[PDB]
Amino acid sequence: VASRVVVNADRVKGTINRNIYGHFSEHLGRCIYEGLWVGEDSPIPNTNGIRNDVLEALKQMKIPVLHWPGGCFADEYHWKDGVGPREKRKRMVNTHGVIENNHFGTHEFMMLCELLGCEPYISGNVGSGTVQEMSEWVEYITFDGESPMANWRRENGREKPWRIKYWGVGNENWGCGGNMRAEYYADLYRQFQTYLRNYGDNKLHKIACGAWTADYHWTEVLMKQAAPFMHGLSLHYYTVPGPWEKKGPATGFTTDEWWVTLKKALFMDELVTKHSAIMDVYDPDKRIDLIVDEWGTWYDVEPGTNPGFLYQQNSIRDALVAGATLHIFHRHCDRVRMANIAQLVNVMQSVILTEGERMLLTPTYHVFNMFKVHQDAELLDTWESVERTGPEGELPKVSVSASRAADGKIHISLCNLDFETGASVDIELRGLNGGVSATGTTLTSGRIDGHNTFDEPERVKPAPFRDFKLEGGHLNASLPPMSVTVLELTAG
Amino acid sequence: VASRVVVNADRVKGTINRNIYGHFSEHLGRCIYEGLWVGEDSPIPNTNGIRNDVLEALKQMKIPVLHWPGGCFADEYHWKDGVGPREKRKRMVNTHGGVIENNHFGTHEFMMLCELLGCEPYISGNVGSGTVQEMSEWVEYITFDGESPMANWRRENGREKPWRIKYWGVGNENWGCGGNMRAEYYADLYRQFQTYLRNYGDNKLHKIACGAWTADYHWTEVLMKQAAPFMHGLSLHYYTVPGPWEKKGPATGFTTDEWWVTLKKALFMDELVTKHSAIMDVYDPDKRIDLIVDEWGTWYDVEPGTNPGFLYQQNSIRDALVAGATLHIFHRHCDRVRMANIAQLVNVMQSVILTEGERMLLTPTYHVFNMFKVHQDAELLDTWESVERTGPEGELPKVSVSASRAADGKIHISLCNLDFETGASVDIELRGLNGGVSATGTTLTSGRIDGHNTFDEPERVKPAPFRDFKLEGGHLNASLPPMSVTVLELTAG
Amino acid sequence: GGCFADEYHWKDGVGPREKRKRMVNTHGVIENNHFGTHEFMMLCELLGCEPYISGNVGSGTVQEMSEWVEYITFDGESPMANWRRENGREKPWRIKYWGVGNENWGCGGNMRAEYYADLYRQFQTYLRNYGDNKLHKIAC
Ligand SMILES: OC[C@@H]1O[C@@H](O)[C@H](O)[C@H]1O
Ligand SMILES: OC[C@@H]1O[C@@H](O)[C@H](O)[C@H]1O
Ligand SMILES: OC[C@@H]1O[C@@H](O)[C@H](O)[C@H]1O
């Protein structure tokens, strides 16, 4: 009982925008402080106050875009608090022990993006901010002439303006960003965006706040009232295994929790399909990007940690959620052009966890790093007929995607969602000229909650994958249980 | 500069419902009277009052469904006027150049016509000027197998057992000649009327709500949002009209600009179907509800000297291309479009048949339906294409292509060449085959841009064997004639 | 009714009992209309209870409902009141409780409230108080 797949290697169905592989860092818990920003004279080795171990890991992963500063924090932030002499910035401390000293602000974020080579994506404050304030932020960042804002930027140490495309006009406006009706947010959106200018040769890509989960009415109102004034519309969807008040743990979970988690993750396909169908009615040429800028798993925090800091472990279950979710974005790459997993470090479904100077790479990191070959690749036409798995055959056993990279290699990625047995897959390759050869890598575990710890940071990591044969133009593979695999094919 | 196509012969994308090949006959002009119904004692040879030359042609074409009685006539018709003893049927005669509706063709004659043809009946009830009880009683008259005044009347009138009928239109053209209704108002009437249309015995109704005219997307949105749970199908109406309303242009003797405009307006169907279907997707993402394109086709000025009210127009190779390209568009949308009905069957608009007393002819449109019948209930195959352009600014595709697999495993590939000036080279690669294949072909073409059939010369434009292709291995290279519709039949093994 | 009320045509249940409308469904239900308006009004008189009749909005007409009230309650000369007298009830009956349709959101026409409200307002307009009868109009 093999799954079967045909790849039409000569038939391109679209481009997987590299920004599908995006990330998100809020001023929350240890995502910014400790996770990234340590300060210049921290004993943690760093470049301009940003820790080097994280920088190198993220550069290796080819991080394409980073969204900051939130999240809920964005519609509470006043950006002027985070610029100027670092020592005189605004400080807040709540003992009920959270500290925001604003040492990481606009200059530090823009520097971080330059060091990583990624695009900045900033969310401005609609909920508690003013139109002038947001307009001035853009001017501060991008204007090259003389004005109070651009002069202030130069005094603060950046002589030439920066470039920025991605600009969120508020975030989470239906909830923590002002508890707004869609019709009211649409009006504020139209007003605020009006004053966000393109200075010099910078071109903004304005993004309106989109729906939470299955709020289709939100998407309809925003498209109907504001489509001509946006470049992009967001969408937020978290995979939460249990109920809100008892979500379940990141490790030590039951087999039922495995199946539920994956089934909830796959709901993304229905969401994206239905939101995109509404977008099609108002924007049939697909001008406007759909931006899935919050996704990932959300569990109860690790026992004994502060629930407000959202610290959770990351297992092979999380790797499968990431791999299957990225595949869903690939299938929707005609409309989805950016996505941002929540969140980068020490918060929710992170690629990295830190503990002082130590860090580890999660199983989620390994998926992003293995799948980077799909960034800006051409999606190829594939068709499939796959075994079922799970309690009632409710899940596909295998998720598969194929793309062609700019040097002509083909990458095929495969997730096996069953933790109990391996998955046979037969792949036929059509439309090739040459013969091809293949190598592979696989990420798997011997436990359903296999994870990395600071003491054992390499229990779950990629390994060479050799359990396939390629005879002519069939590639038959035996995927391990609970695994994510990538095959690289070279022609000639 | 060949157009290129790849057919994945092992990859099925959908089923082309046979009802895509449907037809439409209104009580208008000579579509019903003379076109079909001549009366039992006519010297025109006939079967129970229906002329035999038309019956045989329509059976050969494998007509799958026939919509009656309208059109605008349906929201004016009171069905009880069309049953019972012929001499007590309602009679209307207008001298203002003369028009007779004697109701000799009514419910029993229509159902007989469908049984003779082997096609499904599709009846449109009267919402605009009718009542809820009236429509309910029509369904009961036709379908109930028990005892009641309606079922007993049907038995008195000569049909003992009930008929089966699926397709039932709850009003027609309600935005215009069926009551000038706002969508919100129609949707409420629709919900009310449909409530009383019952499934008697083992009959199952397929209730169809009146859908949009052309690009009235608001109509589709309101009907889907207010009435989707109460319908099985939603209609759509789009005519290809070359010129303005007041001067549409002629069926023959037209300019080359009129050729290009005609075809470009026909292809607009694709955008309409796409956009209406997108709205349907929002409210019915599983595609339960059928899209029913129950009026389409060309509409020209009438033939000079004929009554404009009778809608009589000629039919040329231009009309064949419209039909072939439009059917291909329906194939591409066969995941949602499950019926279509070209307007109209005989002597009216884009007809398959024209008659003149006892003589008849088959139009170029007939030949397309008759050639493309191999696509009825076939499996649509995955094809991809990269085609030359044609027309003044390369605004048109030179070629339209569709492939399907029939129940016996043969593959049919149909191809339209939209350029009247030169032939079209097409290279087709076949993937996913086991055996070798061989191929035969037929083509419909003309030497003139307005080539048509007349009663004196009824065979100027008709299908012929097509041999101008080679099949080496799994490439099929073809040279399509100018202004042509072609079908290739491939047999494997 | 019930669902039957927005399918009933009251004229089917009056006149010589033997010539009333008959329906039979073998899939074995029989409606011979032997129990109609006169029989119901008699039943209420025998029991000493008030009659409460539901008229047909969903598949009925405004005139039909208006004529039902007139048939039952008018004491003068008209086609409806004369028909009542021929059918054996010389003086009119009294009736208060009159339902203007039933179950109109479902089996009585699958109506939106806003649409039923408009039909309600239209139908009720023509339900008159004849002689000393006073109707008590009930909306679904
Ligand atoms: O990952 C972001 C979390 O969810 C969002 O609602 C808030 O920013 C934070 O609480
Ligand atoms: O197809 C027939 C014409 O178009 C329809 O709209 C009317 O019935 C008639 O005038
Ligand atoms: O008691 C009445 C029942 O419920 C109502 O909906 C119908 O009249 C009948 O089916």
mmCIF file of N, CA and C in Angstrom, chain A residues 3-49:
data_model
loop_
_atom_site.group_PDB
_atom_site.id
_atom_site.type_symbol
_atom_site.label_atom_id
_atom_site.label_comp_id
_atom_site.label_asym_id
_atom_site.label_seq_id
_atom_site.Cartn_x
_atom_site.Cartn_y
_atom_site.Cartn_z
ATOM 1 N N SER A 3 1.713 5.180 -1.063
ATOM 2 C CA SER A 3 1.202 6.429 -1.638
ATOM 3 C C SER A 3 1.806 6.604 -3.010
ATOM 4 N N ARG A 4 1.076 7.215 -3.939
ATOM 5 C CA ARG A 4 1.615 7.475 -5.276
ATOM 6 C C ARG A 4 1.604 8.941 -5.598
ATOM 7 N N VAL A 5 2.625 9.383 -6.299
ATOM 8 C CA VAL A 5 2.776 10.750 -6.695
ATOM 9 C C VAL A 5 3.318 10.836 -8.107
ATOM 10 N N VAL A 6 2.837 11.774 -8.899
ATOM 11 C CA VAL A 6 3.434 12.115 -10.173
ATOM 12 C C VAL A 6 3.850 13.545 -10.120
ATOM 13 N N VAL A 7 5.095 13.829 -10.495
ATOM 14 C CA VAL A 7 5.595 15.166 -10.634
ATOM 15 C C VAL A 7 5.792 15.472 -12.069
ATOM 16 N N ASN A 8 5.086 16.466 -12.572
ATOM 17 C CA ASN A 8 5.370 17.010 -13.866
ATOM 18 C C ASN A 8 6.433 18.076 -13.817
ATOM 19 N N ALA A 9 7.664 17.640 -14.052
ATOM 20 C CA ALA A 9 8.848 18.441 -13.865
ATOM 21 C C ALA A 9 8.974 19.571 -14.797
ATOM 22 N N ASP A 10 8.198 19.546 -15.855
ATOM 23 C CA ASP A 10 8.266 20.635 -16.821
ATOM 24 C C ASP A 10 7.078 21.554 -16.704
ATOM 25 N N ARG A 11 6.226 21.377 -15.713
ATOM 26 C CA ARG A 11 5.042 22.207 -15.627
ATOM 27 C C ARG A 11 5.058 23.070 -14.323
ATOM 28 N N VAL A 12 5.289 24.336 -14.468
ATOM 29 C CA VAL A 12 5.361 25.247 -13.329
ATOM 30 C C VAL A 12 3.975 25.823 -13.023
ATOM 31 N N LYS A 13 3.544 25.769 -11.773
ATOM 32 C CA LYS A 13 2.262 26.275 -11.350
ATOM 33 C C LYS A 13 2.291 27.609 -10.596
ATOM 34 N N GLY A 14 3.454 28.109 -10.273
ATOM 35 C CA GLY A 14 3.593 29.382 -9.639
ATOM 36 C C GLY A 14 4.948 29.464 -8.963
ATOM 37 N N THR A 15 5.167 30.586 -8.304
ATOM 38 C CA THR A 15 6.366 30.862 -7.545
ATOM 39 C C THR A 15 6.040 30.880 -6.055
ATOM 40 N N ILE A 16 6.827 30.143 -5.299
ATOM 41 C CA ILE A 16 6.736 30.127 -3.837
ATOM 42 C C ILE A 16 7.541 31.329 -3.375
ATOM 43 N N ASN A 17 6.867 32.430 -3.038
ATOM 44 C CA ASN A 17 7.561 33.620 -2.560
ATOM 45 C C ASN A 17 8.404 33.248 -1.336
ATOM 46 N N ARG A 18 9.658 33.664 -1.318
ATOM 47 C CA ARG A 18 10.545 33.354 -0.174
ATOM 48 C C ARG A 18 9.954 33.772 1.161
ATOM 49 N N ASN A 19 9.179 34.855 1.153
ATOM 50 C CA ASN A 19 8.514 35.352 2.367
ATOM 51 C C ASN A 19 7.512 34.440 3.014
ATOM 52 N N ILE A 20 7.103 33.362 2.340
ATOM 53 C CA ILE A 20 6.367 32.295 2.991
ATOM 54 C C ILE A 20 7.106 31.704 4.167
ATOM 55 N N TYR A 21 8.423 31.821 4.132
ATOM 56 C CA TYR A 21 9.323 31.301 5.178
ATOM 57 C C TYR A 21 9.645 32.374 6.237
ATOM 58 N N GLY A 22 8.720 33.317 6.446
ATOM 59 C CA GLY A 22 8.956 34.401 7.376
ATOM 60 C C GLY A 22 8.783 34.079 8.866
ATOM 61 N N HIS A 23 9.202 35.068 9.669
ATOM 62 C CA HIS A 23 9.237 34.960 11.115
ATOM 63 C C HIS A 23 8.722 36.244 11.780
ATOM 64 N N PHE A 24 8.538 36.135 13.072
ATOM 65 C CA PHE A 24 7.784 37.111 13.836
ATOM 66 C C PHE A 24 8.423 37.174 15.238
ATOM 67 N N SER A 25 8.781 38.396 15.642
ATOM 68 C CA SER A 25 9.331 38.622 16.992
ATOM 69 C C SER A 25 8.630 39.781 17.697
ATOM 70 N N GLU A 26 7.925 39.474 18.749
ATOM 71 C CA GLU A 26 7.268 40.484 19.571
ATOM 72 C C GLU A 26 8.117 40.767 20.853
ATOM 73 N N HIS A 27 7.972 41.978 21.367
ATOM 74 C CA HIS A 27 8.421 42.327 22.730
ATOM 75 C C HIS A 27 7.546 41.618 23.763
ATOM 76 N N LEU A 28 7.857 40.355 23.988
ATOM 77 C CA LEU A 28 7.096 39.466 24.834
ATOM 78 C C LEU A 28 8.034 38.398 25.357
ATOM 79 N N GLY A 29 7.954 38.106 26.651
ATOM 80 C CA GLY A 29 8.775 37.067 27.289
ATOM 81 C C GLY A 29 10.268 37.300 26.953
ATOM 82 N N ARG A 30 10.948 36.255 26.486
ATOM 83 C CA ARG A 30 12.358 36.375 26.124
ATOM 84 C C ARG A 30 12.607 36.293 24.622
ATOM 85 N N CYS A 31 11.653 36.764 23.812
ATOM 86 C CA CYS A 31 11.844 36.732 22.374
ATOM 87 C C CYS A 31 12.848 37.808 21.939
ATOM 88 N N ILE A 32 12.659 39.049 22.367
ATOM 89 C CA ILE A 32 13.565 40.121 22.007
ATOM 90 C C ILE A 32 14.716 40.179 23.042
ATOM 91 N N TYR A 33 14.394 40.385 24.315
ATOM 92 C CA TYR A 33 15.406 40.471 25.386
ATOM 93 C C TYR A 33 15.835 39.059 25.750
ATOM 94 N N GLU A 34 17.160 38.852 25.663
ATOM 95 C CA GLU A 34 17.841 37.553 25.787
ATOM 96 C C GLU A 34 17.796 36.719 24.483
ATOM 97 N N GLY A 35 16.625 36.537 23.923
ATOM 98 C CA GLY A 35 16.560 35.788 22.684
ATOM 99 C C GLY A 35 17.344 36.366 21.529
ATOM 100 N N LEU A 36 17.378 37.677 21.434
ATOM 101 C CA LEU A 36 18.094 38.329 20.386
ATOM 102 C C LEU A 36 19.006 39.390 20.972
ATOM 103 N N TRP A 37 18.423 40.372 21.661
ATOM 104 C CA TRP A 37 19.157 41.512 22.186
ATOM 105 C C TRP A 37 19.745 41.112 23.553
ATOM 106 N N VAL A 38 21.074 41.176 23.638
ATOM 107 C CA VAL A 38 21.754 40.936 24.932
ATOM 108 C C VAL A 38 22.458 42.180 25.411
ATOM 109 N N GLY A 39 22.634 43.189 24.599
ATOM 110 C CA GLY A 39 23.440 44.348 24.989
ATOM 111 C C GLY A 39 24.918 44.188 24.593
ATOM 112 N N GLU A 40 25.575 45.281 24.292
ATOM 113 C CA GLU A 40 26.929 45.273 23.692
ATOM 114 C C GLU A 40 28.003 44.646 24.606
ATOM 115 N N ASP A 41 27.844 44.837 25.920
ATOM 116 C CA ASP A 41 28.843 44.316 26.893
ATOM 117 C C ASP A 41 28.310 43.187 27.650
ATOM 118 N N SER A 42 27.301 42.506 27.130
ATOM 119 C CA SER A 42 26.986 41.189 27.624
ATOM 120 C C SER A 42 28.220 40.239 27.383
ATOM 121 N N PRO A 43 28.468 39.327 28.299
ATOM 122 C CA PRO A 43 29.388 38.261 28.027
ATOM 123 C C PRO A 43 28.920 37.263 26.941
ATOM 124 N N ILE A 44 27.653 37.289 26.557
ATOM 125 C CA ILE A 44 27.214 36.498 25.399
ATOM 126 C C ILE A 44 27.827 37.129 24.185
ATOM 127 N N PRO A 45 28.578 36.335 23.372
ATOM 128 C CA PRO A 45 29.184 36.978 22.197
ATOM 129 C C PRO A 45 28.128 37.556 21.266
ATOM 130 N N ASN A 46 28.354 38.749 20.795
ATOM 131 C CA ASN A 46 27.366 39.500 20.113
ATOM 132 C C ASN A 46 27.952 40.429 19.121
ATOM 133 N N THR A 47 27.115 40.836 18.168
ATOM 134 C CA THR A 47 27.465 41.870 17.193
ATOM 135 C C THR A 47 26.514 43.052 17.417
ATOM 136 N N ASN A 48 27.051 44.166 17.842
ATOM 137 C CA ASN A 48 26.307 45.379 18.168
ATOM 138 C C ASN A 48 25.148 45.163 19.149
ATOM 139 N N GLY A 49 25.274 44.183 20.032
ATOM 140 C CA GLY A 49 24.311 43.876 21.057
ATOM 141 C C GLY A 49 23.373 42.732 20.740
#
